[PDB]
């Protein structure tokens, strides 16, 4: 299963000019495009090797759309400031994410937006109705219902976007369609005279989805398991670890289990 996603953010700054627009694009867990309004020369640039041979005018179509959604965002922040009867001196944020989630057949699409960190309006799972978070978002729902806005979004989600997502998988098939299994090792740190720490490591895996669990004599353990956020390594892979505290002299009774796409079957580690 593969996906194409986009994330757009706009931050207003009263008294400091006009808002700041940024947008990023992704194929599954691999970014490939970006646009910064505060850049020295704002234009869409490639971040992945499989979009560098696409043509300078596809790169102007893309750029001209980024500059369009930035102007559209400027108006929305003004309307949203009026919807909530908000003062003129405060900064606000407007987030927007959407994508297409295709056996290779199209499955689902999504389109959601947020105002100042909270949910605002979202395209429903049928891609025909909306869900407004409050009364202010009902003003938007009334507008996009009379404009038949949902039908235009569905045309892109189930049409143009599954076309280009299918195309990106062919041009970068050597990296996009190749899972990398995690590389694991276990450490040990004595805390006191009767306490120690066991850390199960998972490095260099792709995609980012992974599960880590500690077990004492075959029973799941989460009362004493520390879990960090899956973090990027900076080279296209990800890392993660999980730590459990144990009585010293009992470390041999603990096992770490790893679940990942690239493994033939789950792992089972000991110190």
């Amino acid at each position: 299963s593969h996906s194409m996603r986009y994330f757009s953010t706009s931050v207003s700054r009263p008294g400091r000019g006009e808002p700041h627009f940024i947008a990023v694009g992704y194929v599954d867990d691999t970014q490939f495009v970006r646009f910064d309004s505060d850049a020295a020369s704002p234009r869409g640039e490639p971040r992945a090797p499989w979009v560098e041979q696409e043509g300078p005018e596809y790169w102007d179509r893309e750029t001209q759309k980024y500059k369009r959604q930035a102007q559209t965002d400027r108006v929305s922040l003004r309307n949203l400031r009026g919807y909530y009867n908000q003062s003129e001196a405060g900064s606000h944020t407007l987030q927007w994410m959407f994508g297409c989630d295709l056996d290779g057949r199209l499955l689902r699409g999504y389109d959601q937006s947020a105002y100042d960190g909270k949910d605002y309006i979202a395209l429903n799972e049928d891609l025909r109705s909306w869900t407004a978070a409050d009364t202010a978002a009902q003003i938007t729902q009334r507008k996009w219902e009379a404009a038949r806005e949902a039908e235009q979004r569905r045309a892109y989600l189930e049409g143009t976007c599954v076309e280009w997502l299918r195309r990106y998988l062919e041009n970068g098939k050597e990296t996009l369609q190749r899972a990398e299994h995690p590389k694991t090792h276990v450490t040990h740190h004595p805390v006191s005279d009767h306490e120690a720490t066991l850390r199960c490591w998972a490095l260099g895996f792709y995609p980012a989805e992974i599960t880590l669990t500690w077990q004492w004599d075959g029973e799941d353990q989460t009362q004493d398991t520390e879990l960090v956020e899956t973090r990027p390594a900076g080279d296209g892979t990800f890392q993660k670890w999980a730590a459990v505290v144990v009585p010293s002299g009992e470390e041999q009774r603990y096992t770490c289990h790893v679940q990942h796409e690239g493994l033939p079957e789950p792992l089972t580690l000991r110190w």
């Binding site: 893309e62 959604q69 309307n79 938007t140 404009a147 806005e149």
Partner: peptide, 8 residues
């Protein structure tokens, strides 16, 4: 491929 929509 990006897509720009309407105003909120």
């Amino acid at each position: 491929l990006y897509n720009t929509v309407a105003t909120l």
